[PDB]
Amino acid sequence: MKILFVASGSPATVFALAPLATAARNAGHDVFMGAVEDMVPYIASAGIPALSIAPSSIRRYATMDREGNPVRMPETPEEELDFAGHWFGRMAAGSMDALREVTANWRPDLVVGGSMSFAAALIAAELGVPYVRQAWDTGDAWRTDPAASDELRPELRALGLDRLPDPALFVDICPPSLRPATAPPAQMMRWVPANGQRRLEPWMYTKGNRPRILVTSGSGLVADMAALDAEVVIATLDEVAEVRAGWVPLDVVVPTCDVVVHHAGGVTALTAMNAGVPQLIVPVEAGLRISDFGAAITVDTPEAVEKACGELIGNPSYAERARELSAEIAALPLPAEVVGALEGLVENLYF
Amino acid sequence: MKILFVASGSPATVFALAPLATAARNAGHDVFMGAVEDMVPYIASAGIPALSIAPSSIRRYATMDREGNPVRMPETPEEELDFAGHWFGRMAAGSMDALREVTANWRPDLVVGGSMSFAAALIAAELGVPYVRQAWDTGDAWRTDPAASDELRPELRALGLDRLPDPALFVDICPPSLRPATAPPAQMMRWVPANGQRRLEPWMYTKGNRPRILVTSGGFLRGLVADMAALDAEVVIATLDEVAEEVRAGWVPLDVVVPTCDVVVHHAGGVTALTAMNAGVPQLIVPQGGNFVEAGLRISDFGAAITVDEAVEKACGELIGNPSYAERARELSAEIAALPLPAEVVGALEGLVENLYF
Description:
The structure is a homodimer. By secondary structure, chain A is α/β, with parallel strands linked by helices. Chain A folds into 2 domains: 1-189 and 332-351, Rossmann fold (3-Layer(aba) Sandwich); 200-331, Glycogen Phosphorylase B (Rossmann fold). Helix content of chain A is 42%, strand content 17%. Chain A has 15 helices and 13 strands. The first copy, chain A, has helices at residues 12-26, 40-45, 58-61, 77-93, 96-105, 118-127, 141-151, 153-158, 221-226, 250-253, 266-275, 285-293, 302-314, 316-330, 335-346; strands at 2-7, 30-36, 50-54, 110-114, 131-135, 169-172, 187-188, 212-216, 231-235, 244-246, 259-263, 279-282, 296-298. In chain A, the strands form 2 sheets. In chain A, strands 3-2-1-4-5-6-7 form a 7-stranded parallel sheet. A 6-stranded parallel sheet of chain A has the order 10-9-8-11-12-13, with helices on both faces. The longest helix of chain A is centred in the N-terminal third of the chain and has 17 residues, at 77-93. The two termini of chain A are 19 Å apart. Chains A and B meet through helix 1, helix 2, strand 3, helix 5 and helix 15 of A and helix 1, helix 2, strand 3, helix 4 and helix 15 of B. Chain A: InterPro entries: EryCIII-like_C, EryCIII-like_N, Glycosyltransferase_28, UDP_glucos_trans. Chain A: One of its GO terms (molecular function) is UDP-glycosyltransferase activity. Chain A: Residues 1-23 form the signal peptide. Chain A: Pfam families: EryCIII-like_C (PF06722), EryCIII-like_N (PF21036).
């Protein structure tokens, strides 16, 4: 069947949705993944047919309201969520022209979107096909969703809807022990790496006698790690790689690490959670939860990062929490199994 | 678990193995695929971690042996089979250094290779791990295997063996309809596309009123486009970016474009042939040394294709116009849809690594 993936939220949605897209394709479905223009190279290099559904400036443009007015800044934690919902709502609105044009020529039987990919929902409703939502669930939907519905009222009333329609299925990649205690039941999935590649070098898959530290990514720690006889790897852009620097396949290299140092960016977090390597977060809501679990530390200077690093290598609990989380994750339904549930949403309906 | 894939020949072998490697990776196994140096970009672009296990210059072993003796060019299909066994055997031998060195740092639990990837069998034996062999028709190996065993007899004897060790499992992607009754048992599998991508353009997924013809090539073409004018046909040419300057032409996502075509014209390069069989599109085959010519004649004799003597305009007219060709292509596609998916075959690979005594 034809399956349209829509990754219109944050840039990190692409990488979150990639393994399910890969599995659908690998089960012989025709899969296209659409996203903001600047995400298209990442989709394509992961080996998924890739569509551009909005120009790159949409992110900056969607911070203005739909009548070109600037929008005041949120003033409370709740307003922050509401304003994000309007923002995601405007990103969705600006994906619709492309999605309508694509779907007039290639009509999906099913639409899968990311956590905040509301264009997935509208286009699914417009076509009258089942809608699936995949998230690393944080229990924010109850807040972000009415606000997005708010924003998309012209489009929803065109479909005679009051609010955005519920997905026919919710897929959660957040590990059980990190899920919000009042979260509704969900279809679990093990996120696994799905991304572009280059030729491997020996050092990338060699374990080594000494500790290996990964820092991602370049835009007092090294002195500390030198005092641990540790191998320090920095993931960076090729041209700035002028300590081991340059392109790093996270999937290949993370498992050979004892620590991964990264910013609140989703990819490393996911790779490290699945591989079971302790993390050091330098600020997202995910990290906080992995920290609360003790598989990671979230810091505040290079001094804070230095001490956090030594704790995570010296205190053996952080690694032990990372391993058990990894074990839990390894028991979750594989992307290929979840493909089985997607196929059921299209068949398996009452006549 | 750690699974090493070994692709030996042309880009066709990489693309034959890509969906199973992609399935194993996508189930959370740590998967590396190795090949000759210039095949590496095709592995990586498919999204699979890629190792170079031989320099491109290893291909000259086609014309010279290990001792430095000239190897005469084969003159009949008969001779050609014996030749390929020895040639791929020589190339297996020149991959062994790089494979031993990789596996000393990253030890695979299981090794998968293509039909002629004898280095996969050799390293699996050295490591004492299971060896899986993927083929389009397992019943055809009887011709080339003895020749390779010959070639690799010092390596094989150092391992205590007499010949190439039987695989722990065959994976066969030949549809049962195209498969000889006497073919050896195999895990059957549905091959599906797993390859690199670029940004899609609308024409690629937009099916129009006119017939659409794909020609894939790295001649008959000019006289083919002219004739298809009377058909008002849209001709699309999958070829190198540089040739595309001299109809649409250039980079074509075969997996996306083939389902929109009424016919595919190719040279029994396996990649187009696999894609069209899976998608259910009839085929015009212009044979010239292609490694999938046998497969093409089987598809032709099935009635889903024509293999020309080279002409092409006529055959083309028939494949678009006579309804049986498209009808037989759908039959074959439907039979392929029902075969075990790559993800299901990963389960069988997982089974192979157990000591049943515990």
